[PDB]
Design an enzyme around this catalytic site. Structure first.
Site, PDB file in Angstrom:
ATOM      1  N   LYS A  17     -74.044 -75.583  10.733  1.00 51.46           N
ATOM      2  CA  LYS A  17     -73.711 -74.200  10.294  1.00 51.46           C
ATOM      3  C   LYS A  17     -72.305 -74.285   9.663  1.00 51.46           C
ATOM      4  CE  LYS A  17     -76.293 -70.336  10.507  1.00 51.46           C
ATOM      5  NZ  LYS A  17     -77.766 -70.454  10.341  1.00 51.46           N
ATOM      6  N   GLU A  85     -66.336 -65.340  24.579  1.00 45.80           N
ATOM      7  CA  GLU A  85     -66.725 -65.488  25.961  1.00 45.80           C
ATOM      8  C   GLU A  85     -67.693 -66.728  26.130  1.00 45.80           C
ATOM      9  OE1 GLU A  85     -69.124 -62.127  27.242  1.00 45.80           O
ATOM     10  OE2 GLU A  85     -69.886 -63.188  28.991  1.00 45.80           O
ATOM     11  N   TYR A  86     -67.475 -67.524  27.166  1.00 46.66           N
ATOM     12  CA  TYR A  86     -68.348 -68.630  27.499  1.00 46.66           C
ATOM     13  C   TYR A  86     -69.479 -68.146  28.416  1.00 46.66           C
ATOM     14  CZ  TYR A  86     -69.639 -72.738  30.356  1.00 46.66           C
ATOM     15  OH  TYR A  86     -70.368 -73.743  31.003  1.00 46.66           O
ATOM     16  N   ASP A 130     -80.299 -60.071  13.458  1.00 45.15           N
ATOM     17  CA  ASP A 130     -80.508 -61.487  13.777  1.00 45.15           C
ATOM     18  C   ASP A 130     -80.902 -61.861  15.201  1.00 45.15           C
ATOM     19  OD1 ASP A 130     -80.467 -63.790  12.003  1.00 45.15           O
ATOM     20  OD2 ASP A 130     -78.992 -64.730  13.296  1.00 45.15           O
ATOM     21  N   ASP A 148     -73.724 -64.138  18.166  1.00 44.03           N
ATOM     22  CA  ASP A 148     -73.952 -64.212  16.722  1.00 44.03           C
ATOM     23  C   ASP A 148     -74.138 -62.896  15.966  1.00 44.03           C
ATOM     24  OD1 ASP A 148     -73.573 -66.897  16.991  1.00 44.03           O
ATOM     25  OD2 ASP A 148     -75.609 -67.496  16.447  1.00 44.03           O
TER      26      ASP A 148
HETATM   27  N1  SKE Z   1     -70.131 -68.603  23.521  1.00 45.32           N
HETATM   28  C1  SKE Z   1     -71.034 -69.490  24.029  1.00 45.32           C
HETATM   29  N2  SKE Z   1     -71.131 -69.852  25.288  1.00 45.32           N
HETATM   30  C2  SKE Z   1     -72.134 -70.769  25.228  1.00 45.32           C
HETATM   31  N3  SKE Z   1     -72.574 -71.462  26.336  1.00 45.32           N
HETATM   32  C3  SKE Z   1     -73.336 -72.559  26.337  1.00 45.32           C
HETATM   33  C4  SKE Z   1     -73.444 -73.210  27.560  1.00 45.32           C
HETATM   34  C5  SKE Z   1     -74.280 -74.334  27.657  1.00 45.32           C
HETATM   35  C6  SKE Z   1     -74.925 -74.919  26.574  1.00 45.32           C
HETATM   36  S1  SKE Z   1     -75.779 -76.320  26.843  1.00 45.32           S
HETATM   37  N4  SKE Z   1     -76.951 -76.143  27.866  1.00 45.32           N
HETATM   38  O1  SKE Z   1     -74.754 -77.195  27.364  1.00 45.32           O
HETATM   39  O2  SKE Z   1     -76.207 -76.724  25.615  1.00 45.32           O
HETATM   40  C7  SKE Z   1     -74.786 -74.297  25.320  1.00 45.32           C
HETATM   41  C8  SKE Z   1     -74.014 -73.127  25.209  1.00 45.32           C
HETATM   42  N5  SKE Z   1     -72.601 -71.024  24.011  1.00 45.32           N
HETATM   43  N6  SKE Z   1     -71.862 -70.186  23.288  1.00 45.32           N
HETATM   44  C9  SKE Z   1     -71.983 -70.046  21.919  1.00 45.32           C
HETATM   45  O3  SKE Z   1     -71.222 -69.336  21.287  1.00 45.32           O
HETATM   46  C10 SKE Z   1     -73.114 -70.778  21.289  1.00 45.32           C
HETATM   47  C11 SKE Z   1     -74.122 -70.078  20.769  1.00 45.32           C
HETATM   48  F1  SKE Z   1     -74.021 -68.750  20.781  1.00 45.32           F
HETATM   49  C12 SKE Z   1     -75.232 -70.733  20.238  1.00 45.32           C
HETATM   50  C13 SKE Z   1     -75.247 -72.115  20.235  1.00 45.32           C
HETATM   51  C14 SKE Z   1     -74.200 -72.818  20.777  1.00 45.32           C
HETATM   52  C15 SKE Z   1     -73.133 -72.146  21.309  1.00 45.32           C
HETATM   53  F2  SKE Z   1     -72.093 -72.801  21.851  1.00 45.32           F
END
Ligand code: SKE
Ligand code: 5E2
Length: 257
Positions: A17, A85-86, A130, A148
């Site tokens: 992206k 935010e995570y 989206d 998103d």
């Molecule tokens: N803000 C956000 N938090 C997360 N958390 C997260 C935690 C674990 C995993 S995993 N299982 O490790 O792949 C992946 C993401 N993603 N995130 C994003 O903006 C985000 C998103 F929206 C879409 C794709 C990737 C991202 F990163």
């Protein structure tokens, strides 16, 4: 107010992206968060600096527990950084890959969470446009969070699976678009794939414009009723979010605090 030196960068969470998301910690507060790192080059080349500034402005004012917070932003000579935010349980997209479809309880719960977030959104005349499993995150209590916000504008692209007919035809579109998207989600959650998947963009276009989906056998009548009510060509016939939240299939299978 913000600079990269304020953050300790951890591992990648996903890739662009326009850019990647990384886990990070703010040095002072020890606050764990996620950093989207977009390169100014791509943004300029795809000509999206305008929509990004839009998204960021929209996202930063929204406060809802099913919407992903943007805390802030900054930029360097070569990058724009968003402080998000995570969501520690990842994407719904990946959860779906792992389970190869959801049961009714999880589906009805996700749809309640989503319809609530969308009610809040529409009550500020924000249409998402989206909503898709790659844009849906899960919080620590497994609660759905929309992410998103880009691609959304004050009422009234890759794969076309989640788009309604009036939008793929280029016509007028209102809030009813998000109701279509929910019916596509509700389908994909229960079946494991979206209702108009095809091997080409051109077949999917046809399937959407003509509203050509069939239910597998395991899909129950209450699920078939709400999906069929949401996937109507005339935006006018789609129900309101409140009718969705009070649908007998939802009330019977969902969860509430
Ligand atoms: N803000 C956000 N938090 C997360 N958390 C997260 C935690 C674990 C995993 S995993 N299982 O490790 O792949 C992946 C993401 N993603 N995130 C994003 O903006 C985000 C998103 F929206 C879409 C794709 C990737 C991202 F990163
Ligand atoms: O150099 C800049 O002034 C520049 C700033 C930003 C920006 C600033 C603040 C918030 C957000 Br969201 C984006 N975006 C850009 C995208 C592309 C290019 Cl070529 C330049 C920029």
């Amino acid at each position: 107010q913000w600079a990269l030196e304020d953050f300790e960068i951890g591992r990648p969470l996903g890739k662009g992206k326009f850019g990647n998301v990384y886990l990070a910690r703010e040095k002072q507060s020890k606050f764990i968060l996620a950093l989207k790192v977009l390169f100014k080059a791509q943004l300029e080349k795809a000509g999206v600096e305008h929509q990004l500034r839009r998204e960021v402005e929209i996202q930063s004012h929204l406060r809802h527990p099913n919407i992903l917070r943007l805390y802030g932003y900054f930029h360097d000579a070569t990058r724009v950084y968003l402080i998000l935010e995570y969501a520690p349980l990842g994407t719904v997209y990946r959860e779906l890959q792992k389970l190869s479809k959801f049961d009714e309880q999880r589906t009805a719960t996700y749809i309640t969470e989503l319809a609530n977030a969308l009610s809040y959104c529409h009550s500020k005349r924000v249409i998402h446009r989206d909503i898709k499993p790659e844009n849906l995150l899960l919080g620590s209590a497994g609660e759905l969070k929309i992410a998103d916000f880009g691609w959304s504008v004050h009422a009234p692209c890759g794969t076309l699976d989640y788009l309604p007919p009036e939008m793929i035809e280029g016509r007028m579109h209102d809030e009813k678009v998000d109701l279509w998207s929910l019916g596509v989600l509700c389908y994909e959650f229960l079946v494991g794939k979206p209702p108009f998947e095809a091997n080409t963009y051109q077949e999917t276009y046809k399937r959407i414009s003509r509203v050509e989906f069939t239910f597998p056998d395991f899909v129950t009548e209450g699920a078939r009723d709400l999906i069929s009510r949401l996937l109507k060509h005339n935006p006018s016939q789609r129900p309101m979010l409140r009718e969705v939240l009070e649908h007998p299939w939802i009330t019977a299978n969902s969860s509430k605090p």
